[PDB]
Structures are given as C-alpha cells and as structure tokens.
Scaffold this active site. Sequence first.
Site, PDB file in Angstrom:
ATOM      1  N   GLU A  11     -11.897  47.153 -54.332  1.00 29.13           N
ATOM      2  CA  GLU A  11     -11.730  46.073 -53.333  1.00 29.13           C
ATOM      3  C   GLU A  11     -12.769  46.011 -52.181  1.00 29.13           C
ATOM      4  OE1 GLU A  11      -7.781  44.807 -55.009  1.00 29.13           O
ATOM      5  OE2 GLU A  11      -9.319  43.955 -53.643  1.00 29.13           O
ATOM      6  N   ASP A  20     -11.559  36.008 -50.832  1.00 27.24           N
ATOM      7  CA  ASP A  20     -11.450  36.793 -52.019  1.00 27.24           C
ATOM      8  C   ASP A  20     -12.093  36.047 -53.176  1.00 27.24           C
ATOM      9  OD1 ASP A  20      -7.844  36.894 -52.949  1.00 27.24           O
ATOM     10  OD2 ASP A  20      -9.422  35.423 -53.347  1.00 27.24           O
TER      11      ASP A  20
END
Length: 162
Positions: A11, A20
């Site tokens: 991540e 994202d």
Amino acid sequence: MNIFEMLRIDEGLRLKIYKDTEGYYTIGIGHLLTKSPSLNAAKSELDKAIGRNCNGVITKDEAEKLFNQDVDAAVRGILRNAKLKPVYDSLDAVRRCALINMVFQMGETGVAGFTNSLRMLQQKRWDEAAAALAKSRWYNQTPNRAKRVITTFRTGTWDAYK
Ligand SMILES: [Cl-]
Ligand SMILES: [Cl-]
Ligand SMILES: [Cl-]
C-alpha cells in the site's frame, strides 16, 4: 516478515490525501477516507478520523496509528465472520497473513464472496485456490499485488515479498 511489513510494501505510505487505484480518496497506509468525489468530504473524514484539523495532511505517527487500527479491525472482522473464521482457523501462519491482506484491501464482505477459493483453501488445495483467485476483477485491476498474495497462498512462504 510480518503482516505490517507485508502491507506497508503493498500500500505504500503517504502523508497527504491521495487517490487510490480506484480513484478514491486515501491517506497514509491504504487508509480509505471516502468513496465520494468530494475533496472536501475527504478532509472532514480525515479530521474526524484524526481528531484534528488536518487539512489533508498527516504525520507518520498518525499514519501508523491508523494502520494499527485497521489491521486490528481486519483481524477482528475475520474472527467474527462466519465464512471467514473457519478458513483462517484452518490456515498456517503465512497463509493467514494472506487472508488478512485481502481483507484489509477489499473488506470482509468482498473477500467473503470468493466462495470457491475459500473452500479450496480450507481444503488445502493450493494450486486450485490460486487458479480461482486469479479469475477475478481484483486480479485484473491490481495484478502485481494480487499475484504476490496469490503466491503467498500457493506457497506458504514470503517469497514474493522477499
Ligand atoms: Cl471464488
Ligand atoms: Cl475473470
Ligand atoms: Cl498492483
């Protein structure tokens, strides 16, 4: 290698609001703030979450406090979910991290929809499970992180992250 290092790899770490891979506003270590299009709905979520006026920016420690929370949440959600709990119970320690990974990323509900794959994991049919997991939007949307996790399940080793 532990769950926290595995997800930090997967991540990244960002101290300022960002989008994202799916276009949603995120912060820190894959901490989803909102699905909403509003950069403003995101700054408020952020302040709500931090307990301070952040203005889209946080500290590392903060980023880490949120990660602590989410990983804990992920584990408690598995252990509480009827479809997930037995699977996890049945796994070794490495494959366990792999299910934590998927749950942190796609939530409890979505992972719980991978019926067949879950069934083959629970039955210890590594190659079959790896094959089904791959036939998913998930795999098609983020193929590198996906293969990594999928490899974790097939092998039972941290190879893919090493
Ligand atoms: Cl499936
Ligand atoms: Cl497909
Ligand atoms: Cl990816």
